[PDB]
From Swiss-Prot, chain A:
UniProt cofactor note: Binds 1 Mg(2+) ion per subunit.
Classification of source organism: Eukaryota, Metazoa, Chordata, Craniata, Vertebrata
Organism, as annotated: Homo sapiens
Keyword Acetylation listed: yes
Pathway: Sulfur metabolism; glutathione biosynthesis; glutathione from L-cysteine and L-glutamate: step 2/2
Disease: Glutathione synthetase deficiency: An autosomal recessive disorder characterized by massive urinary excretion of 5-oxoproline, metabolic acidosis, hemolytic anemia, and central nervous system damage.
Gene giving rise to this polypeptide: GSS
EC number(s) from the headed UniProt entry: 6.3.2.3
Keyword presence, ATP-binding: yes
Official protein name in the record: Glutathione synthetase
Family: Belongs to the eukaryotic GSH synthase family.
Cofactor(s) needed by this chain: Mg(2+)
CDD domains: eu-GS (cd00228)
């Protein structure tokens, strides 16, 4: 479809068509100027065209989501695994220490909730081996863009239709993760067993991605389930527990706490840490619970790759273990010791093969990674980082539409996300599924730079 | 209302307003800002009401029931050269805008009309007058025969009002909001004209200025056409001057592509035309393409034609043997008065000078009330420019309370009045009427500032 654009004039004309359709379809962010206000909005950056994705790789990513849901839930329930895995990390990293301290406090007091759920997103890249599916990470707190991802297929159908490619417009895959994500919260709300109780959505006041979050709220409203949006500071001021640890905000009972904040250390303060502890101690279901946020950390991801580790967490499930392990790339501990020393030495000698990732645009490549490794080698801070195999997908051409940037065709690579939803009542899994996908695409330079834009996986 | 009376403090109102605005944005109820009217990189919501305003079912039904009569009336006017010439003979001597529209109309009649396909997308607007008995009566403000607006955004607002009522657990009331999709019906009129034109590869040409806040409303019509494999190009009058060309059969080409339908979303006001833009308007009118509207149909929507249509026996002359249609049309007419030279115009001027509260002064080309109207009438009485104005009965609906949401303005409950619009679509091949229908409604509400989008809640 690229060949049909004669020059920059035709490209800019098609880009204008795409942008106006994206806005009409609700593919929206607040402005960076006014992240607290909907009095002006922009479009969420997205690709002019849907990017080609081999059907086998998309199928493989879908086929392992229920395994990842079981694995994260198994990790969240294994106090010894979490403590052994994170012991060195919590000594160095204040953020992980504070999350772990809340986990320890609620384990000590006893878990108040009987309803557990996860809304997550497992992210992959296509490694040049033929392409192979390899996991970047799994996002177990504030799994984003399921709302906007439900709105972009119509935009790509519009762009292909403008070019009279109506057969190709029809091959774009329908995608509605926001319905599935909402249905996970709705199931947890039903199991909590208070018809008048609310869903509490924790979000900071500065939230450019509010429309993505409102999509989940709109789906719950359609099912007569009401959401209140509150900050951690609002919970510090107004939240409290009754004698049975039921959570009340503004006199209203809370059934489900849905986090869309609390993933990064700068989002906290003393009062916000106090609020996170109050929420975790409550009888409300948490999405995620504190142990499940810990299950999504880089150090857990690295330790899950150790020989025999998956078998220990998922006993007697060889097919599930095989599907999970197939997605694992090289993951290396940088902890003090000979093994961490070898990984540092390998990355100093061949920096193009590795990425340095803090326990958390913070990843380091090339010369910046080499400078950081020289500083980390004789620092106990080395426990707060992992090294990973650099995944280099085959670049391809697309046009990344972002406000303030002229429409230009550039070399790109993608990240494929699968949205997972599971719900457990006590020890019993009642829901475990995939609910849709997210393709995001970034310009290369080879290191991906700029923020990833929304895309759709065109099946080939 | 059951919903309105739950909002007792400013914090409650502001919280519900935030819910409304976020849902409106998600539903594509969008408008460019006044300061960035050429760019879609930063936009906002089209102003709208927090709640749907109460509208008597009988008045909505009456407005729908007269639309097909208005479509016949405007089409009949457009085809009656003698009626247009007699009606506007004094107007064209004084008003440059009417003179230039009329001159194109005359040049095309003299050359011969090239198109064989005709259509109108229009919007007939009403207010609810307090009648003698105290019961409201439906009275026409005007009919918009060029660039009939907001049928795209009106297709998107019902979901917003359902959301607001659902937040308040008023799900029965959310269910009673009327479904409304004028965007689809308006596009289907263009699609019918495109089918009758008979060129599978011909385009719809949408004429629009580069400075266009209401682009999203316009795109809704384009989206509906694209769903039916009909393609739109947006061009300015300046683009048509540069690139528009006719073949020996007066087929219109832009960038080598044939044009089946010219859909005007510009050209309703004099300030939109340079001399080059008037040349472009003539080129388009001379072409074989269907025009929405044709120049005669734009003239059919003007204030002077509106007033002359109220003369005794005039409807009967334009719509012979149609007594039930004539009665439905005439029922909606308020007082409309010529200000042309002569005793009658003198009588209207004297009545308004003496009792200004009863009247509004309206230009043919900016409506004047009270003291401002009196000063203007003193200046117009001994001026030939009186031919460029009509006097109209002042319609004062019963005020009611609602909350008008506008970007950058605080949420406030204020006294309001509404205008109810009905969208009309008709398509004709030569003498054969192929489509004639209503396709939806538009309720707009204003503080007693800008009219905001609303929905008529049936009572």
């Amino acid at each position: 479809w690229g060949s049909l654009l004669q020059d920059k004039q035709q490209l800019e004309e098609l880009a204008r068509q795409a942008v106006d359709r994206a806005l009409a379809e609700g593919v929206l962010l607040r402005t960076s100027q006014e992240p607290t206000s909907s009095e002006v909005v922009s479009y969420a950056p997205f690709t002019l065209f849907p990017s080609l994705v081999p059907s086998a790789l998309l199928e493989q990513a879908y086929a392992v989501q229920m395994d990842f849901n079981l694995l994260v839930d198994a990790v969240s329930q294994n106090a010894a695994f979490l403590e052994q895995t994170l012991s060195s990390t919590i000594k160095q990293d204040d953020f992980t220490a504070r999350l772990f301290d809340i986990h320890k406090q609620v384990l000590k007091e006893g878990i108040a909730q009987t309803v557990f759920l996860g809304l997550n997103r497992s992210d992959y890249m296509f490694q040049r081996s033929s392409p192979a599916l390899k996991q970047i990470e799994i996002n177990t707190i504030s799994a984003s863009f399921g709302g906007l991802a439900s709105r972009t297929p119509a935009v790509h159908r519009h762009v292909l239709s403008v070019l009279s490619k109506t057969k190709e417009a029809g091959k774009i895959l329908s995608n509605n993760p926001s319905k599935g994500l909402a249905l996970g919260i709705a199931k947890a709300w039903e199991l909590y067993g208070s018809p008048n109780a609310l869903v509490l959505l924790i979000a900071q006041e500065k939230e450019r991605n509010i429309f993505d979050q409102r999509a989940i709220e709109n789906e719950l409203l359609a099912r007569n389930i009401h959401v209140i949006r509150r900050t951690f500071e609002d919970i510090s001021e107004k939240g409290s527990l009754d004698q049975d640890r039921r959570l009340f905000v503004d006199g209203q009972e809370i059934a489900v706490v849905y986090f869309r904040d609390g993933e990064m250390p700068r989002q906290y303060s003393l009062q916000n840490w106090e609020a996170r502890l109050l929420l975790e101690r409550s009888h409300a279901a948490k999405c995620p619970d504190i142990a499940t946020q810990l299950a999504g950390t880089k150090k857990v991801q690295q330790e899950l790759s150790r020989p025999g580790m998956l078998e220990m967490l998922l006993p007697g499930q060889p097919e599930a273990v095989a599907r999970l392990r197939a997605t694992f790339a090289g993951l290396y501990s940088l902890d003090v010791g000979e093994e961490g020393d070898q990984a540092i030495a390998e990355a100093l000698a061949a920096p193009s093969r590795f990425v340095l990732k803090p326990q958390r645009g913070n990843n380091l490549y090339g010369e910046e990674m080499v400078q950081a490794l020289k500083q980390l080698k004789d620092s106990e801070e080395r426990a707060s980082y992992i090294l990973m195999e650099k995944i280099e997908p085959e670049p391809f051409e697309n046009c990344l539409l972002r406000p303030g940037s002229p429409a230009r065709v550039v070399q790109c690579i993608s990240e494929l996300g699968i949205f997972g939803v599971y719900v457990r009542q006590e020890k019993t899994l009642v829901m475990n599924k995939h609910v849709g996908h997210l393709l995001r695409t970034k310009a290369i330079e080879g290191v991906a730079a700029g923020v990833a834009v929304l895309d759709n996986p065109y099946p080939v």
